[PDB]
Design a protein around this ligand. Sequence first.
Ligand SMILES: [N]S(=O)(=O)[C][C][C]C1234B567B89%10B%11%12%13B85%14B%1158B%12%11%15B%139%12B%1061B%12%112C5%153B%14874
Ligand SMILES: [Zn+2]
Length: 258
Amino acid sequence: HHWGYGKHNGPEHWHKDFPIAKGERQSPVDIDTHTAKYDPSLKPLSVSYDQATSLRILNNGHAFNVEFDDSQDKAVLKGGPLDGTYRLIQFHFHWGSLDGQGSEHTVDKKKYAAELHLVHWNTKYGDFGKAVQQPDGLAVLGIFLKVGSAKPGLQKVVDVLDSIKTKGKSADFTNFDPRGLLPESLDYWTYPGSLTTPPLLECVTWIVLKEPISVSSEQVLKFRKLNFNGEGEPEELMVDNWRPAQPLKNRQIKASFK
Ligand SMILES: [N]S(=O)(=O)[C][C][C]C1234B567B89%10B%11%12%13B85%14B%1158B%12%11%15B%139%12B%1061B%12%112C5%153B%14874
Ligand SMILES: [Zn+2]
């Protein structure tokens, strides 16, 4: 009886195994755009993905992860609200059963169809497992997805999904360029928060981009053909793999833009 997204094991149950679910800096949150304060001390974000080396794509039973070689400083995030250098380890998505839900963060209570998370760890802690034990250990870049025009840079991901339909399947996934998943603008909101899945550790500086990317209905429909179950098990479509907004508590969301 492991955690997942269903009504007997989903987000309202997670606190029993992970009591930090009811902590002081949980994610995601609703971004109230009129209350977020412009902070002129915030720096532009530096996203350096020119040397990113993807290796593999994995269906972990919750989502799919596109994994990178993080054994050297290649793909790094810096600037913005961050002190120091954060190395890209993986990306994944959260999405819905229908286009009206799927994102984890919300904007003035608006839910997007999906949300991309690019996960990076702070190199000053040496490895990812040490980073997640620190309040400034991770930086996750969050990008909203809306349904309209296709995202050409997403199509390589979409086309490999048939080969990782079920939990525990992986596939080689080299030379994928995550620059093709970024919007034009790097304007962002930022706040201190947590992982949005168990173990829910309070280790993340969230950077949520204001500009969504557009993906096609066909692209998101292929996300929704994945399975939460393993091969040879009854089919449970991989949809609605998002945690709802959590209480903001004693936090301020800052905006990089006027
Ligand atoms: N939504 S999120 O906060 O970016 C957490 C994504 C899930 C996981 B998978 B395992 B390790 B791998 B890394 B940390 B652990 B789970 B948390 C992030 B990724
Ligand atoms: Zn995530």
